[PDB]
Design a protein around this ligand. Structure first.
Ligand SMILES: CCCCCCCO[C@H]1O[C@H](CO)[C@@H](O)[C@H](F)[C@@H]1O
Length: 158
């Protein structure tokens, strides 16, 4: 089991960490959602599907900078919604193929009432997402740590 980003940055067998740089909608009004869809950015595969079934959860999601300060978040994991920053590990997603498959994570961030102006700064850390991988074969239990960075400023109009 290993993962890679849309730009080819990889986290190999045994886990580790990688930076993910995301393009964000430039404008988000109060009452609207800023969508951070990681399913088009993070892809994983099972290295031995003939014998092993891999299980993948979003173990934890933390918010930083402008996201922590200016937004109220939800995380959608494989069709279900949970608070973001996270309060519990999600249920497991099965990886049973060598074909690169999306990690089904998307952040839905709506501005808090105090938000106005530059709510997210270009180049800033916005989130840390921990992918936890286990299997039905041995004791393997690995963390794939994704550091999410904003590629651009996000403005909340006033
Ligand atoms: C002859 C027996 C060969 C055993 C190979 C072990 C491969 O282990 C990697 O791939 C697994 C499947 O994706 C992951 O479950 C695991 F965590 C590890 O990444």
């Amino acid at each position: 089991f290993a993962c890679k980003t849309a730009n080819g940055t990889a986290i190999p067998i045994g886990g580790g960490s990688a930076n993910v740089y995301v393009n964000l909608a430039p404008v988000v009004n109060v009452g609207q959602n800023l969508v951070v869809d990681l399913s088009t950015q993070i892809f994983c595969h099972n290295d031995y599907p003939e014998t092993i079934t891999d299980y993948v959860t979003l173990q934890r999601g933390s918010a930083y900078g402008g996201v922590l300060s200016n937004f109220s978040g939800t995380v959608k994991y494989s069709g279900s919604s949970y608070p973001f920053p996270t309060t519990s590990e999600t249920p497991r997603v099965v990886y049973n193929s060598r074909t690169d498959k999306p990690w089904p994570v998307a952040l839905y961030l709506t501005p808090v009432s105090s938000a106005g102006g530059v709510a997210i700064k270009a180049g800033s850390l916005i989130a840390v997402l921990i992918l936890r991988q286990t299997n039905n074969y041995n004791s393997d239990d690995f963390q794939f740590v994704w550091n999410i960075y904003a590629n651009n400023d996000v403005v909340v109009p006033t």
